[PDB]
């Protein structure tokens, strides 16, 4: 089932409130045709060049970054064009992306929250309507609605009393979340 790690800083936050705040702070890197002219808003795959166990993106407005983990693929120009698909197992949110394909992969200097065992799997044929694509592209473009909706559904599958309106401390009482010391 879904597993969550959170800095005790967010003990009393609801998951919905954390993710809305986090996406407002990360902003929109404007990964849009005509606005992607170099590597500052593309993100990166591990290993790449167009597939990876990780896809990571640094914010262009702040130090925020996220890391999507799983078995992910980007169609580039191939039909259906500009689709991120495959397996999305994890999302990590925090500050300061670090690493590369030869240095141990991607990580966050200050991870705040992570969502693991997401068990999302979108086939290429769903295109940009796939759940994985919408979840990750939402984060790229400053809109965590799709991620929130996916975390909501997984938490209710553990117990219908849980939801993205639960606090991290409540989810840890439920056994799904685990507090990490702040830093």
Give the integer Cα–Cα distance in Å for 177 and 113.
10
Question: β-pairing, 64-74 with 105-116?
Answer: unpaired
Nominal resolution (angstroms):
2.0
Total number of domains in the chain:
1
Residue 10 marked in a binding site:
no
Residues 6+ positions from 22 with CB-CB distance below 8 Å: 64, 93, 112, 113, 144
Q: Give the structural domain span for 143.
A: 1-183
Residue 128 marked in a binding site:
yes
Burial 161-171 (b: 16+ CB within 10 A, else e): ebbbebbbbbb
Residue 32 marked in a binding site:
no
Residue 133 marked in a binding site:
no
Residue 73 marked in a binding site:
no
Question: β-pairing, 177-180 with 105-116?
Answer: unpaired
Expt. technique: X-ray
Give the integer Cα–Cα distance in Å for 130 and 153.
16
């Amino acid at each position: 089932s879904i597993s969550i790690s959170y800095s005790t800083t967010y003990s009393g936050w609801t998951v919905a409130d954390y993710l809305a705040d986090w996406s407002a702070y990360f902003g929109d890197v404007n990964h849009r045709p005509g606005q992607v002219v170099d590597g500052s808003n593309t993100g990166g795959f591990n290993p790449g060049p167009f597939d990876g166990s990780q896809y990571a993106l640094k914010s262009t407005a702040s130090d925020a970054a996220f890391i999507a983990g799983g078995d992910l693929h980007y169609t580039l120009f191939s039909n259906p064009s500009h689709t991120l698909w495959g397996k999305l197992d994890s999302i990590a949110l925090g500050d300061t992306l670090t690493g590369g394909a030869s240095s141990g992969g991607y990580a966050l200097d200050s991870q705040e929250v992570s969502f693991s065992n997401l068990g999302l799997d979108s086939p290429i044929a769903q295109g940009r309507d796939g759940t994985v694509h919408k979840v990750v592209y939402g984060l790229m473009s400053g809109d965590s609605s799709a991620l929130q909706g996916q975390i909501d559904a997984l938490l209710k599958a553990v117990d219908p009393s849980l939801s993205i309106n639960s606090t991290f401390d409540q989810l840890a009482a439920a056994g799904v979340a685990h507090a990490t010391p702040a830093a």
